[PDB]
Design a protein around this nucleic acid. Structure first.
Ligand SMILES: OC[C@H]1O[C@H](O[C@H]2[C@H](O)[C@@H](O)[C@@H](O)O[C@@H]2CO)[C@H](O)[C@@H](O)[C@@H]1O
Ligand SMILES: OC[C@H]1O[C@H](O[C@H]2[C@H](O)[C@@H](O)[C@@H](O)O[C@@H]2CO)[C@H](O)[C@@H](O)[C@@H]1O
Lengths: 436, 436
DNA sequence: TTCGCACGTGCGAAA
DNA sequence: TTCGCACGTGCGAAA
């Protein structure tokens, strides 16, 4: 739990938390506040559960697509810095991270997925998804493989599903039609059927995850992988001579990844609101603060106008943005979670053969639009059934008391119902069949 | 699923899976059989779910306490090693992997928790748990702390709980008594009360987990920690000059850590059983094989006598074994999982203040002693309640059909029963109050 | 051991 | 939207 005079941080484990801790130490020595950095599993899930009761960290670090839903359950609101602080940063970044006209986190970077290939096994990477299966055959003879990426999180598979026209939600009339989904359209069918085919033809495995894909590339067993800028520092420590390049096309159409803006939301239950902002704006949104974090794990296209002009000329960042221009920024609406859960179920079930591509995407189309029942709606159901059982319980209580039926020493209510049935002129069989 | 002619292995993320991968690479070089090593989260729980349907890996690596529950479910191949090979390992390691007379896993190493301390900060490690809060007072004056360890897994807190008399199950007459659970006795109460006292007096944090303590000791913010031999390699590459020593005493009695034998079991659904037995016997359980895994992450006191005579020359191993002699080998009985879940819930609830020490431990004793109903018993309950509902359903079906009781278009069963009551000479109030 | 009511939510109906 | 039966398991009783 929170407490005054301290600062705790929740960032994803694949991020530069150790470089984030190097500056929290620089903050501590300056004005006396100990800063600790923790990278918990499933932090984007634990936060909306615990912070309702006042728990959680002072600041949470996640991409912006969840954040509007976090704002909607009242976990942050109304963050305002001065314009000197509002403009040492990019206008598109603020737009994504503002829910209903209110800034809800400090944007920290811009991330997109790109194709990462080893120049040693693949001097010329493939430009198209369609030549991938033939490539894997040439590399399977040498003992290696073509492509391995995270098939568990749909973030990595969406560039291919969207390539031929699948869309999460449609933007029209200055608004996201939170009903209109395009996970069941013919475009999504072409994308997923190709991915499932890659698995059916043994070019990829349906159980592949992050560690499985990251290890196969860093050890040189797989020519290409699909990852974000955070994965670069790990490939740097390995003996792999890699290049970052545009993701391959599918049916002459580009791959369209979902672009994420890493953001720091201040917990509305924190007591360190201003102290945390002291960390945010004055000690880590500086050149030297982003350096310490980027040296550990590359943030990607950082959003600080000052620091980014140094990073934008790294050819790896330039390729990361060639992929992002081809993609779309992620909606921050609360129904992102329902869409992300549904498509995750679709890919996993279609990759494993539990469902057809038709059945998985059709089920995902309805799940991504499903409404979560309110707390009041749940309690209304609970209370109504609680009343029902109470009404029946009182009735049978009186029948067992004053009925004086010929009942066994112990018997369920159905026996009482039967005995009271025959008194009214009915005959009840063994299985409950009743008549006059 | 597992393919014929391939080997896939599951080991915990804190072990040297990269070292184990190099052993598989040599196995691939001599027999042409690819070996893939994965470290998925919650593998101790994932395995009994997938392996029942014939899925899971070929070989699973875990401490020996979980294997008996696996074997009772028929998930493991029975280990058939030559008598000549069984003599190559310490006999008591074979005992940890014996269940119902059969051998069910290949014992790899012996693991016991020890006190790891920073020699530069604390040259003389405290010999007693009770003197630790005083050590923290001196330490807080430097901005440091004394002790930090994983508070989320009961494996780390148990040596304190067991010191003054707590135990899991009592051994008597050649078997463990699953109904004699000692997580509620006075010794276990005092041990946990002390730990909760450390948290109440701000000498330790209840949210502390593995990565938080491992990061803080390696970064030199705490002078002591509690961890097994696997954690040394990260400290080695760190700047801390460290020593491994016996765990401190509590009320004059030593801490009694549960001793675990890292073991490799063979999935019963594996068409590569002969291949898995070959890889474990002639490539891993050798000097060169265990050395490769050990150089990655220290295994501890290996079961193989030939390589252990070399590893025993290590003062850190002779200290790890000094703690082991004061502790106990875990049971491998299937109830161990239920004991681990109960104590895990208790320590977390007590460390957080959600429950008292007396309430949490009393609930842990009933949970760890609760008899898990068999599948058939669960099914019996499900069918009996299904039959009870169908009987009531047929009665209300016939009442609605031949009653003509003069009720609305739609109405619940309670109203039909109400209408039948008045037909038989009763009256029913709104809340169900019923009499003649 | 079996047994039966309680419990909160699922699923779809009826509107 | 509210509604109501079905669902499988919890808890405790009776033995
Ligand atoms: O898989 C759904 C998941 O996708 C995105 O998560 C990314 C995240 O943006 C990256 O920073 C990194 O952590 O990889 C993640 C995928 O594993 C969305 O941001 C997230 O909301 C969504 O759940
Ligand atoms: O915390 C309960 C846990 O204790 C043991 O797990 C140990 C394991 O023996 C070590 O190899 C290492 O991984 O630390 C683990 C605890 O985090 C038991 O073996 C395990 O069954 C139990 O769940």
């Amino acid at each position: 739990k929170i407490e005054e005079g301290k600062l705790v941080i929740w960032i994803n484990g694949d991020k530069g938390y150790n470089g984030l801790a190097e500056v929290g130490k620089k903050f501590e020595k300056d004005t006396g506040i100990k800063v600790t950095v923790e990278h918990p599993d499933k932090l984007e899930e634990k936060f909306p559960q615990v912070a309702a009761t006042g728990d959680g960290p002072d600041i949470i670090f996640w991409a912006h697509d969840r954040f509007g839903g976090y704002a909607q359950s009242g976990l942050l609101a109304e963050i305002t810095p001065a314009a000197a602080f509002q403009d040492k940063l990019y206008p598109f970044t603020w737009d994504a991270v503002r829910y209903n006209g209110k800034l809800i986190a400090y944007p920290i970077a811009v991330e997109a997925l790109s194709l990462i290939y080893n120049k040693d096994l693949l001097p010329n990477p493939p430009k198209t998804w369609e030549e991938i299966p033939a490539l894997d055959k040439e590399l399977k003879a040498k003992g290696k493989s073509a492509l391995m990426f995270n098939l568990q999180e749909p973030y990595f598979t969406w560039p291919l599903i969207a390539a031929d026209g699948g869309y999460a939600f449609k933007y029209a009339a200055g608004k996201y039609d939170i009903k209109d989904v395009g996970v069941d359209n013919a475009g999504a069918k072409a994308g997923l059927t190709f991915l499932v085919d890659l698995i059916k033809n043994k070019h990829m495995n349906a159980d592949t995850d992050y560690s499985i894909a990251e290890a196969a590339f860093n050890k040189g067993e797989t020519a290409m992988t699909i990852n974000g800028p955070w994965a670069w520092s790990n490939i740097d420590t390995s003996a792999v001579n890699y290049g970052v390049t545009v993701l391959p096309t599918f049916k002459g159409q580009p791959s369209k990844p979902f672009v994420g803006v890493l953001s720091a939301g201040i917990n509305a239950a924190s007591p360190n609101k201003e102290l945390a902002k002291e960390f945010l704006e004055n000690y880590l949104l500086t050149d030297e603060g982003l350096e310490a974090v980027n040296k550990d794990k590359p943030l990607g296209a950082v959003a600080l106008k000052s620091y980014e002009e140094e990073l934008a000329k790294d050819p790896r960042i330039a390729a990361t943005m060639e992929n992002a221009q081809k993609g779309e920024i992620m909606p921050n609406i609360p129904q992102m979670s329902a869409f992300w859960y549904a498509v995750r179920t679709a890919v996993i079930n279609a990759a494993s053969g539990r469902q057809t591509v038709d059945a998985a995407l059709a089920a995902a189309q309805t799940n991504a639009a499903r409404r979560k029942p309110s707390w009041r709606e749940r309690e209304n159901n609970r209370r109504r059934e609680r009343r029902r059982r109470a009404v029946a319980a009182k009735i049978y209580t009186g029948l067992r008391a004053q009925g004086d039926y010929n009942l066994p020493k112990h018997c369920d209510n159905n026996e009482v119902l039967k005995a009271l049935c025959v008194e009214a002129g009915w005959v009840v069989e063994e299985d409950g069949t009743t008549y006059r």
